[PDB]
């Protein structure tokens with residue numbers, strides 16, 4: 001089929017994976033070792049996240065995501081202005097305090113400065129730091145002009161998840177209530193992405209991250225524990241996510257001279273995909289033989305999210321990714337129009353010629 005042919009072209013080369021994995025591990029392990037020499041980052045550890053580690057990276061293994069996590073004992077959180085996702089952290093760490101507030105901006109600034117100085121000492125490999133991207137909690141490196149790596153500082157809390165998550169992670173009918181309880185016993189993370197404050201931002205605030213839980217779900221994604229472990233249980237969940245990501249990426253590439261698509265991200269499709277899995281919890285609703293129908297249902301669900309301007313964060317239901325505070329109505333209408341055209345014409349944006 002056409003979709004199967006697209007999936008074939010999206011597969012990663014084993015040779016590319018081998019080379020990229022070696023490059024990234026070498027650079028990241030070095031930066032970890034050097035950061036641990038600083039008094040403030042002594043206890044840092046690594047957590048691999050995002051599409052490469054979820055086995056849904058497409059085309060080339062040229063973008064990796066990692067968290068450098070730090071456990072801070074006796075952590076106390078205060079929600080910022082009923083935003084549900086953003087928090088003050090109250091508490092060798094004195095350098096980052098603003099009163100009793102542990103400033104996200106201050107910690108990120110030193111983290112970035114250390115990494116920038118350390119990549120300058122790496123002489124056996126071309127490593128540079130990309131310019132700051134507003135709204136990202138990550139420090140982004142480019143290795144050998146080819147491989148991007150996002151390194152996100154994170155504080156780790158082993159306390160119960162914040163109350164704003166109480167009604168999220170609605171996986172009970174799909175992955176089980178037992179699994180939901182087990183996942184909610186794991187730590188959660190705070191990353192230095194700041195809440196909007198008018199036309200500025202609250203530079204002290206941090207944002208909740210559950211990227212490790214997203215990875216565990218994607219890598220253990222069936223109602224059956226043996227989903228995708230044998231030829232009789234090959235579902236099309238990840239294939240549908242890959243196709244949705246490629247659809248969005250290709251449209252963003254086409255309309256790049258346009259502004260209306262700049263705010264859409266693969267996280268929007270990832271979030272919508274998790275909701276589709278919640279609404280279709282049986283592995284038999286994702287049979288490989290039904291790839292075209294499954295993908296079409298993912299597309300129409302995403303269209304409905306755009307039209308209603310509703311895409312709840314999977315962990316924090318009152319955080320609407322498609323709120324008008326984040327994305328203009330006209331931008332959602334513009335993307336709706338382009339996706340409808342693709343659906344109605346059997347996805348010409350997928351064709352090479």
Ligand SMILES: Nc1ncnc2c1ncn2[C@@H]1O[C@H](COP(=O)(O)OP(=O)(O)NP(=O)(O)O)[C@@H](O)[C@H]1O
Nearest residue numbers: 049050051052056057058063065211214266267270
């Ligand atoms: N807006 C967001 N809110 C919460 N978490 C986010 C957000 N954007 C990114 N993340 C997290 O950061 C990870 C890496 O982001 P990103 O590299 O943009 O996407 P990805 O999922 O790795 N897909 P790809 O486009 O293949 O890189 C995501 O998988 C999420 O876990």
Ligand SMILES: C[C@H]1c2c([nH]c3c(Cl)c(Cl)ccc23)CCN1C(=O)c1ncc(OCCO)cn1
Nearest residue numbers: 065135136137138150152191193207208209265
């Ligand atoms: C660090 C992460 C990230 C963002 N927001 C976050 C929130 Cl809110 C939380 Cl909680 C945690 C992590 C993140 C945006 C930026 N991130 C990305 O990985 C990223 N990578 C590649 C992109 O483009 C590729 C095509 O050009 C765009 N983004």
Ligand SMILES: [Mn+2]
Nearest residue numbers: 050051063065
């Ligand atoms: Mn990524």
Ligand SMILES: [Mn+2]
Nearest residue numbers: 050064065150
């Ligand atoms: Mn990234």
Ligand SMILES: [Zn+2]
Nearest residue numbers: 222227228235
């Ligand atoms: Zn499966």
